[PDB]
Amino acid sequence: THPDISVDVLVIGAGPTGLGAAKRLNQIDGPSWMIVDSNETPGGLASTDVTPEGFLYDVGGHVIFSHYKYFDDCLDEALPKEDDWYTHQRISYVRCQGQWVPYPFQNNISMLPKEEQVKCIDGMIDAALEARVANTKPKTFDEWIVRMMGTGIADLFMRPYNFKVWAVPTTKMQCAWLGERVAAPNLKAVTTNVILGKTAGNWGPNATFRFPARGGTGGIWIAVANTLPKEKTRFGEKGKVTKVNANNKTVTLQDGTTIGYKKLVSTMAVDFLAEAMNDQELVGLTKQLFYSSTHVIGVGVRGSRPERIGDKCWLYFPEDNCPFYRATIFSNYSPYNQPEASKKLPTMQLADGSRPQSTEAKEGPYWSIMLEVSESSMKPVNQETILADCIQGLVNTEMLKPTDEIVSTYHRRFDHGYPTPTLEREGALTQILPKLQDKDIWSRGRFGSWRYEVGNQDHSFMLGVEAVDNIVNGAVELTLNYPDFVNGRQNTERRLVDGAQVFAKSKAQ
Amino acid sequence: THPDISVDVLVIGAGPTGLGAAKRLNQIDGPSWMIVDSNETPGGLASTDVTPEGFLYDVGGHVIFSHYKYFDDCLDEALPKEDDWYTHQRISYVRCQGQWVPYPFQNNISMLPKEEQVKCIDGMIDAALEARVANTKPKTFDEWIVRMMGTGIADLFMRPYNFKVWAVPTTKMQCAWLGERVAAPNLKAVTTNVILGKTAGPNATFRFPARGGTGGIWIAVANTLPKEKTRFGEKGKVTKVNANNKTVTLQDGTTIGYKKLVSTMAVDFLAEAMNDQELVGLTKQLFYSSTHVIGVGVRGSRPERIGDKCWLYFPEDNCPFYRATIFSNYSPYNQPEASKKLPTMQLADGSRPQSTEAKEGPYWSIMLEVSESSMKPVNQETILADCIQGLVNTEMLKPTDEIVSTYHRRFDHGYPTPTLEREGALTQILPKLQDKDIWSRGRFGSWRYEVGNQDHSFMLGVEAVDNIVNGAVELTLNYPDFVNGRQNTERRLVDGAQVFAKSKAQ
Amino acid sequence: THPDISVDVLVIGAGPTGLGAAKRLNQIDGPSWMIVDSNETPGGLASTDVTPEGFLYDVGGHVIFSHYKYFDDCLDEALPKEDDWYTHQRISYVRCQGQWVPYPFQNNISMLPKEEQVKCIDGMIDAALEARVANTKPKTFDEWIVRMMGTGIADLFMRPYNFKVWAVPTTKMQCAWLGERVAAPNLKAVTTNVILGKTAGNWGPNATFRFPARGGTGGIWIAVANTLPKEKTRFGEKGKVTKVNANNKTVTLQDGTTIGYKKLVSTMAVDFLAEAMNDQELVGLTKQLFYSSTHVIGVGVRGSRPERIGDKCWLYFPEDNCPFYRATIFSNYSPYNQPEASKKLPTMQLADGSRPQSTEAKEGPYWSIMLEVSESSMKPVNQETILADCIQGLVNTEMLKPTDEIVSTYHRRFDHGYPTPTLEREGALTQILPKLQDKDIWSRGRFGSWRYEVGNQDHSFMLGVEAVDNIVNGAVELTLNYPDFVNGRQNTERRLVDGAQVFAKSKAQ
Amino acid sequence: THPDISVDVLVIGAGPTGLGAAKRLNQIDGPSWMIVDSNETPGGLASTDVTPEGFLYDVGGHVIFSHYKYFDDCLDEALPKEDDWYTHQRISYVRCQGQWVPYPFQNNISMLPKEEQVKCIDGMIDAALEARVANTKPKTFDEWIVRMMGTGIADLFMRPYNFKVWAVPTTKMQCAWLGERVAAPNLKAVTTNVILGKTAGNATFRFPARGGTGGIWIAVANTLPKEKTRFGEKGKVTKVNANNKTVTLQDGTTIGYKKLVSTMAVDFLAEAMNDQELVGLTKQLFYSSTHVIGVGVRGSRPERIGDKCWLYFPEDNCPFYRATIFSNYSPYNQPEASKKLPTMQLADGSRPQSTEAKEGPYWSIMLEVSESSMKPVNQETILADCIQGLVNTEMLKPTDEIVSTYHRRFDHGYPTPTLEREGALTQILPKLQDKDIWSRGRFGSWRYEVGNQDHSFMLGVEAVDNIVNGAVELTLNYPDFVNGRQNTERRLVDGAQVFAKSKAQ
């Protein structure tokens, strides 16, 4: 019984990964292919929501750094205008004891209370002397943190911050995900800055990342998707997969439609994939994995951008005076992420939670704040009070004066937000992925692979690109199995226009 | 002006590297391509010569272990019959003080005289203690050796042997080529064997062609190539390379135009043919050694003591060769059958035969290698006599043994020497050539011994093409450690592209 | 009220320590002095007992190495003839798995089952590697052992043997007592003998110790005591101290006699001293000290000395096929430690434990075996049965045949056998000794100072000598406070005839 | 034949070492003894000279820390009044880049310029990381310095300073002499101070109120029975016959001894013995000569330099390696304000306005300069260069009026801890010992570790105690042992003397 549709390669999911596979599939333009997604808007969790008042909010951060030229070609194609991008300085600050400590944290303890400085330096001196002798590798994320920068810096930043991040204690996670690099501290660099009292960090003006002028991050994956042949695309309720028969290689859609495939590139969460296949073996193995939920809170506020935050990026918060682990002045990325000044809007509430004087609609200008909070069984989140608690924190950290007028609020909860690099992660993945692979199924992506190391928009995109390259050209899936390898090098070989397309085109001439 | 022939991808050289490139270019079957070689018989320095008496002798050894599936696939295609191959045990012995020490050397010191075992163990104990503290990497091959297995084993084996091999002292060579594995000994392993007296079944295996020798593989492989895209013989000899206009001048005058050039000739010859004085200067910084390949056919049965098909390494001074093997053990067709009659040329002791009568066999064969360089000269007139004598000293030939054949050929460019100055030159030479759309690859193409093996060189060409076409990462070129530490299964002789393009017609 | 007797320096106890003080006091011959002991026979716990059948047994071992020339002069004086001493080779064996493993045990594992050789070598290799990096000192006797020769040799010899010796597990003892010599194994030496199958250790022929030709060890201290002015000695029931009044510097004897002193050198067990002072403070502190009891078993046997046991030395037993931790062929030290061959003695029992054939008295020759068993609250000893167990042990270790005729037996139990180098030892001693010192009481000796490191005859003797030298000439008590210092050097300065005596005799001339 | 005099024990030299032997010989009061010295004034190179103007200068420093109670007892006896001593704080400074770095140097790098602190901490971070792995002992003085405090502190202070002191590069000297304390820096201690910006290293030493340091040894000698002494031209040793145990004096007097305690320089001793074997071995020893300069200045003492202590100078803007405001130890080391003295010259070197003698008050400075075959010293200009240095280091204003100058050169100033030292002494000392000669002292034993006044004094004390009571010579053979502990056992009144007195009663 032949299916309704028959393609060589079927890509499920129109996120960075899905589009990655699709963009390479369409570049090779050889075997037949098709891409599906239950959402009519391509980009997935890399999209950009908007508020009724017109405030944009990235659901999945932004690419501050790409490791592949291929990824760059694909972005340059979608948004080819210099006016499509706003280059920004890669900045970073850590909120510690009423201080904005620039990245990296260690090289800036010179602006912490001197007593604290001592506890830190001593801690590193211990880590530096133990490293000089260390003959083993760290077993947990915790051990990895100590060895790298002593207990002192381990009690002020890393430990407490990484809990608010992964909602899981550092002792329950592996550390191989961080890289192959030796866990050894640099005393000279840290002591020097303390002595000179010198402060530094970020990078100027060389280290820069680009952000899309309009539409937020979602606009990027939208533009890319539009470079595809629309007949091969299938987005919306018509593209929602409900059943996956790995045995006869047939996918059933929600309406009932069935698609046959020779190779399957799945970018949905593997735990969902397992159920769609109804394989109690995979469902059992997938349950061994672990993830955290994330609350993306947004806050629009009237007035110009406060001097004390100026040029921006993200801010890390290791302390207790706030529920969020990181924040960001999203208004600093592009003026079009907010309504213009002329736009008039009523004030919903003040920063202290008080009532607005008047309900009248006053005009801008406007600036916007975006932040994130993690949820898991070890770190529960009150869905109702977390938005108000964030606004409180924004005040505690002195990012909002209680007299600040909030014009817009935002709050969405993502069940699958962070593929946790637990200690049991690989023990499970070393079974799951091979099994799926035996069924000619390439499960790749942030939750398709379940490896945070390669969950970035540039990594995920290449996962798809490489999964395909493997299926067709038998290319090695580097990013999937060797994160350190790709990260520690400039990947420039593969381009949007390889010698194949060059020769086939000059072939006509 | 337009050249006589014009192809997208021109491959120069018909060795494993060249044939590797050709195989991928022919698999992809997209962009126009052509492979040339000044020699009319494909295979290059991986070919098999034959003596007038009928003895086979490979000139570039054989593959004991493949690192890629794509390499196996191409071999299966050239020799599809099980009968085309013989499977042998991977084994190795070091001749040290009248003893045959199993590989690996350090795990079998229990074969050495005990007094010597002490000096080895003590040395490793020093190594083990220093490794516990080491915070840097070895800088020379010699440093690496010491850290790995101490001075005891260094003076007994590693140091003397590696000079006989590279014709260059261990102190003049880098050590990164050996891999990125930490230079630290394993006492517990070494001590255990000595204590238990144990000497380290199915075992791992390698395959050798039933007929033709190693060269027979590359001939069969080249046959699966569209003959019209091949040009072997004096008609394919490259005499000039114009990198500016991308044109290659053959010996007969024929000119070939290319977009991409995969050159597999010695990069010092390439620079010459380009008349690029800059490259010639840089290329002079590289170093290499010359190898003498000697072969000896002898009447009678094989010595009982040495039945295994493998390598025998010789660190000592009682023989000029550093490497030897009973080539007749690999396949019974590397030497004439028993019924064939041949006269005795000389006895192993160098004496004269009693008569010139042509008698029957059977026959066994030995091959051995000798290295030559400015730091290690070789008398080409007496080297063979010295080898035979050495074959007596190592008790591989009785002075009474009857020698039936002698083979002797000298290869100018034998080994690409991993010197301390190598990468210093190669990081200039390769990128520049790359800026002219020229992929200089291979044993002497890229000059890296780490990947100068048959299976490595073959992939250097394959990957080079895959880089030119599908924009693949040349992993074997820039990351020997990576490809060597894993099983390269992805790339196949039949990839998804061919499967899908074919089933499409259906 | 004034004491019946008055001296400047009073020495309580006529063991090696007390005798040492007396000898230096008689040599100086300046300040008035007197030495008392409740025992009629001088020598203390370094005496020699005799069985009815005429077998000698040292209750306190014998000197195998002198660390001081002064100790030599005094022995030379007491026993001036060459026919008074027998010089023997310092040899030693450890009984391990049916093998006599020469000292040191590590350098002779080349005699154990090869499977054992492996576990030992690996252990040392681990020890050698950790030592190269070690930046701290061992805290207990156990850590010190592991650091020296790895767990392999630790589980085979050290650990089990040292419990049988100290009646306390190696984890409950300090290791400062062993010396300041760095705990690091010698791999090359050990592996060499294993490879060569070489055997050596019990040094010869210049590593020698001398032994008294007659009277056993006890004869030495009896001869040494005789060199003293008898009117200054007071041994027997007339010399028993029953009370010490530190406040008015008076001692009360059993008969009621009182001796007044300026300085007191008390060589009795410090815990008993505290009790004879009625000082509850010192009694409490002294309770924190720990000791073990020792049973000394003797076995006289008919026949010549077997060939295997051969020469004169000590034998160590880590294994539990015997109750004793060390044994010695006491008949090899001197022919006069047992009856002559013409002496007729009946057979008491056979080694197997059965009753002999006839009760008739037969001739010799005879040989003797001496051994020791420790006792504590953690290692109890059945006093009624331990003798038969030792004899059984001698059979199991194959020192006696079941057919060997036992002619004599000996069994004495010493309550205070060994001063135990527990972890709490110096916590108490650094309190006890100073307090007694403030009262002008030099508490010195095996149980006077409670430090086993210097509890030997040669050490003890000097503890007394140096105590007197400190009292009179203000000398430094090196042996008491710096064990390593004296042991690691040749003490030749102090002689039985110093310049003081020489210049006084020549001034005479 | 028989000698003019015959004693059981003869002591040669009335310096701290010799007097230490005489003090114990007299305390024991048993065997016959006598002590000689070619100088009528006892104290040796621990004496105190005086300028014609009335300024005192110690030729051999002063004790800042005693390691023996016996040493204290003997000074207490010589100067029994409390008014005899002044107690000052133990302190010292290093002059580095117009800065006064408190001791110890490392713990006060927070006084150096910021940039310099980086080089120093970076250097120590290297030293600390290497010591964590070190498995051998330093072979030279230099190696010891590099391991202890890194190359930064080495190039800035230690290396250049030590050459000015020993007149020999740090690479030519052993390092056992500094002690057996593990050569390893303390980062936490050093970093803490820099971080806290705090400055730190009560602890005191005593200095005689009158007569300077020499006054001490003069009083100590006075406690000896004069008939057993013999100081002056009459006590000069000119010959030593070690075979018949007879010493000849300059006048011709012959002294017969049983044991000889010689405290003269061992190289001179060998000469006086006419023993070519020892003379040869003695040549392997090395020493530096020292110049002791004294400056008398009119007016009050500079504000910033009020503490009486040592000031060390590693830099080359002055020839001296150490200096001290000797006028801060006691107001009696210089003339009283009412004293009238003419100005000899100004600190800038120029001439005075008038030659009239004006009143004080006065203050004083002393400094030391080393000399050797590897560090020559011009004797005719060294004084003027030291004055210039005092100006460069800003201790003297070019307008300061100099009222007195002192300059003496000592051939045998310091016993150099060279690499060859022990190889020579382990032969020389035993050989003399076999001849019943106890060659002890600063140049008698040649070991700088124990060449201080408190050590030297004990070298004699223990030499006698060895000859008489058979005591171990700890100070001679185990400097670390005696230094790392408080030596309280031996006292000026031992139990021997208590029991002899109470025996009379």
Swiss-Prot record, chain B:
Keywords: Cell wall biogenesis/degradation, FAD, Flavoprotein, Isomerase, NAD, NADP, Nucleotide-binding. The UDP-galactopyranose mutase appears to be an appealing adjunct therapeutic target in combination with other drugs against A.fumigatus. Galactofuranose is absent in humans yet is an essential component of bacterial and fungal cell walls and a cell surface virulence factor in protozoan parasites. Thus, inhibition of galactofuranose biosynthesis is a valid strategy for developing new antimicrobials. Changing R181K: Lowers the catalytic efficiency. Binds 1 FAD per subunit. UDP-alpha-D-galactose binds at residues 60-61, 103, 106, 158, 161-162, 166, 181, 203, 313, 323, 415, 449, 453. Changing F65A: Lowers the catalytic efficiency. It comes from the Eukaryota. It catalyses: UDP-alpha-D-galactose = UDP-alpha-D-galactofuranose. It is an enzyme of class 5 (isomerase). One of its GO terms (biological process) is cell wall organization. The keyword Flavoprotein applies. Disruption phenotype: Exhibits a marked growth defect, reduced cell wall thickness, and leads to the absence of short beta-1,5-linked galactofuranose in the galactomannan and glycoproteins of this mutant. Strongly diminishes conidiationa and increases susceptibility to drugs such as voriconazole and nikkomycin Z. Displays attenuated virulence in a murine model of invasive aspergillosis. The keyword Oxidoreductase does not apply. NADPH binds at H67, R90, S92, Y103, W311, Y313, Y415, R443, N453, H456. It holds the Pfam family NAD_binding_8. Homotetramer. Belongs to the UDP-galactopyranose/dTDP-fucopyranose mutase family. UDP-galactopyranose mutase, key flavoenzyme of galactofuranose metabolism that catalyzes the 6-to-5 ring contraction of UDP-galactopyranose to UDP-galactofuranose, the donor used by various galacto-furanosyltransferases. Controls the biosynthesis of galactomannan and galactofuranose containing glycoconjugates. The flavin functions as nucleophile, forming a flavin-sugar adduct that facilitates galactose-ring opening and contraction. Contains a flexible loop (loop III) above the si-face of the isoalloxazine ring that changes position depending on the redox state of the flavin cofactor. Residues Arg-181 and Arg-323 play important roles in stabilizing the position of the diphosphates of the nucleotide sugar and help to facilitate the positioning of the galactose moiety for catalysis. This is UDP-galactopyranose mutase. The lineage of its organism: Eukaryota, Fungi, Dikarya, Ascomycota, Pezizomycotina.
